[PDB]
């Protein structure tokens, strides 16, 4: 009898055991969701990455940028899921930007390449994915994306906070798609969380004053928050995605859901 | 094993069997909620209505401009749950505004002392409820108040909206008060229901421009909504309402979901 | 060939030469602006201060509580500025709120009848104001109130920040009959400036937590903003409530303009 | 005495005597600024337009997908208006989206590589004209580029909207280093205006229910704005960016300026 009980949800994003998606995936079988996964590129890792998760789980490829992997994409789910199965549920957890584009690497030198790169990993893809997915989901279903909030600019962030932006106006469109299929489309907006990636950047592996100005707004953001964040918990995060892709909230579509500690809400 | 399975949870705001609170009372006793009802003024029509509730729940007077009662609703409470029990979730809906400050009636020709009482009952009374009822509620509890989406204005609503703004306001304070607690404060902004008044409305109560002016924001509103709207169900609000209600959106404060099938996310 | 030339203005607001209605009043003479001032219970004392104005203007009684003073309003102006003349413009600079419901003073402890004083003085009379002088505006006119942005909760201002959404959703309002006119309706939104009360909030005068708060509020704000923030220098804000009385923003209505220095469309 | 007095300004974006920049340019003109134009493509027919313009101005190729030319930009301008002069304005109207990216063309079928170009030349150019020219400006400056609100989806915009959405984030952070220059940055949110190609798009050059929804939006813009929308008429957008443009506006930056008529403030 959980939140999800027999749903049937792909989830994407898994990197390591620290990456949102793996919580989500985890929280999502504890809660019933039967699920199909997809790694990008290194799939031996990710299996074993996801070897952990508390039930066995299909592994499918998918690289966002490869067209070929998102023409087969339905087909090879519907394959891991059994003819005449369709979805209920398909989360976006990815995200990309080169190096040139975040940390102390000035604004204005980010050249467009890789700017264009980012940006179709981390917002075009957003669509890719509903327009190939879209075809094999049921009345009621449940697109989830992750967002982080970009509506003021900030230091280190750069062209990724301009990505965000991009991809909240494709989950405005992507609702329109998808509301011809009975299925809804909503973000979620994430507090800052320690994944790998993130500990590396306060380490310094974008420049010191980038992990400087990120360790300032995780501080921050626990102050902000009225009822806190701890960055090192992904669990309030993946259970909000869960609550999007229920049942429980089955008018909300083309919106951005904040599990954040309510710290947007909160100027200081 | 219902989504609110052993919380306790208050909910004010019924005086139909076509109020949002009744619907809000009706699913949260489905998904197995212990409830406290509130009501105002007149107590035998409200037990009547709420007779027919899947559930009994006792009911308590509460006229939210009355000091007294709200001095003494915490005991009052207590009482009814029994003591050493506290509450789990409290639901505000409640609004009031005065003919004066809405419909055909000049929005300039609305008196203060009308658009203050009308204020007093729709925005204050949040944070009046969330300070009668925080020191008797549960770690990890949850405050939600009904919001109409004030952001931009509109024919008719006039006043109503501003009192609506103030309310959006007056959320974000209180998940302050909240935060203290572990309690979440959060409201949703619903889309048009016709309840009894809204149709009385709509048939001209409040002027005859003013009746076309809402029964084209109806229309206009599912035309928007990606998923649609149907006004004249409101088991989808009632259902957003148990999920802010739940643990499954345990970092979201001082903040508003939109159950209005999308509309707020579309131009046209 | 001042910004305002040949313009009649009516400001409001001034009570000390820090109020930012007196910089208002400055700047609007010194780009060619004929003014009639209104002032609030202390008319010596602000007729001694206007003296300091580069050019006379008559001084008017209008406690915007006082339903008396604003229905002689209109007589009294065109008394001031000759019969078959009109006003260009309109200033509103006044606010209020009682110490119950700002600083350390807990939130839930600001009794409702202070609320509605600070209410009534803080947004309502916006619309007071505006339903007083729209009979006698020029087309193309234009009406301007000062905002504090209240978008997000903050620690101090408490229900002041209250009375500032009300006014937001207030001016959208007032645009919609200002607009019959050919009459503009927008707020400026300035950052924090040092009037004498500020300091006085800042020196402790509402507590000592608040006045930290504030000065913390004050610092992150220079900070945030990206062509900086003197919190001393009203002038900023004044040219920008004479950019909204020229005729340079003639398609701006409803709607708030940000003199912040930026700051609000930055997180860190 | 005019309002830009002095100023010199750079204004991009002309392409015929409809284009929303000849009318930024005549007014700056018109208001004693001392211009240069940048084109794209067909230098010849732009220069036989700008002949109308009230006064000469030297007009410099630029194609912003062109590194080379914006490598040498700041050195040309500075050719055209002497050595040892700066710029006071630089004017950004510039925007393109491949026709699968618009129109009834469905959304998902729009391939990266047409979003791609539609954001760099829409969104990115932003920070590349920025990083151009802002060597060359004044402390005091000002940079202004045009926006179409992008906040909500609509029919047909499709992936212009994206791009408007990329453009505000960009602004944001463009305000950042524009700051280290004492420059401000900031966009015009203008109404709809019926340039050559919108009557194009209206007369069904993207579709048949693509025009129809334009001339719909079209109607329900000047509907809702409260002093109307006159999407003939370009120089109230004009006007807009000129205060922007002068000293009157000197606290804004990072943000956005709505010349609609207040359109966006109203639902209905
Ligand atoms: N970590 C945070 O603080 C934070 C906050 C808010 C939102 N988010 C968002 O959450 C999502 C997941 O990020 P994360 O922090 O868990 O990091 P992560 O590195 O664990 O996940 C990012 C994922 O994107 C995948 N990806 C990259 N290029 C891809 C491609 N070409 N095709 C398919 N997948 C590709 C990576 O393989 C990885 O699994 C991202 O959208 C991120 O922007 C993160
Ligand atoms: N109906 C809609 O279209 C709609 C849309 C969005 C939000 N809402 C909001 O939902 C809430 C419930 O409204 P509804 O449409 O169900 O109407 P309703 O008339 O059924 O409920 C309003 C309730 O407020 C109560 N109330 C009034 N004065 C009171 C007082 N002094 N003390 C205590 N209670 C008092 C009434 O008794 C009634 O139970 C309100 O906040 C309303 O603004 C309604
Ligand atoms: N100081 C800031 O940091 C700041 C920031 C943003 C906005 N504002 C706003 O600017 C406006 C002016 O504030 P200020 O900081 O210059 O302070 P101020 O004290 O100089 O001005 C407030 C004015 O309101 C007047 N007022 C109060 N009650 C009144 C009544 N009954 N009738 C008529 N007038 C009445 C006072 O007499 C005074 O002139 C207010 O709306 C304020 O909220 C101030
Ligand atoms: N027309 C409207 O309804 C409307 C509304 C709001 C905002 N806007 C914006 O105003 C701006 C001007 O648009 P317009 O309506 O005047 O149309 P327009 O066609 O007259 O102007 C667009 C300009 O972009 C230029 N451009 C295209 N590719 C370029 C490149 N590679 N390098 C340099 N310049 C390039 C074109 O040459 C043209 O001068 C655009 O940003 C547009 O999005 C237009
Ligand atoms: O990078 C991140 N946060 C952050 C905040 C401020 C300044 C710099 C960085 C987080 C949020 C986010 O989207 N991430 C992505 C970045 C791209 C690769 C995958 C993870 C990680
Ligand atoms: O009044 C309502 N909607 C509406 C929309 C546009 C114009 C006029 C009216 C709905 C929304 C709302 O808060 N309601 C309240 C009004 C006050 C008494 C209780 C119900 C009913
Ligand atoms: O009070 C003010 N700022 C502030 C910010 C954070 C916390 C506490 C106070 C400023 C802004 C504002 O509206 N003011 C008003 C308050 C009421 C009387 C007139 C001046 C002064
Ligand atoms: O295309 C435009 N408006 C519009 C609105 C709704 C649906 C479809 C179109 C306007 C606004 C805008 O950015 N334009 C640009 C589009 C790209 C080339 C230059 C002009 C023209």
Known sequence: ?????????????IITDSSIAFHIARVAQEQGAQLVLTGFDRLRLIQRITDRLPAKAPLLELDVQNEEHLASLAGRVTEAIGAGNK????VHSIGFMPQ???????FFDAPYADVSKGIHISAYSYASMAKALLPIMNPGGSIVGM???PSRA??????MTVAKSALESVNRFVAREAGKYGVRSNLVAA????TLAMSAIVGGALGEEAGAQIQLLEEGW?????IGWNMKDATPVAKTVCALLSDWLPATTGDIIYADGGAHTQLL
């Open 1 to 13: 009898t959980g939140l999800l009980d027999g749903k049937r949800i792909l989830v994407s994003g």
């Open 87 to 90: 979805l209920d549920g398909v």
């Open 100 to 106: 040139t584009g975040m940390g102390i690497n000035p």
């Open 147 to 149: 967002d982080f909030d």
């Open 154 to 159: 900030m230091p280190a962030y750069n062209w």
């Open 191 to 194: 507090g800052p969380i320690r």
């Open 222 to 226: 626990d102050q902000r928050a009225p």
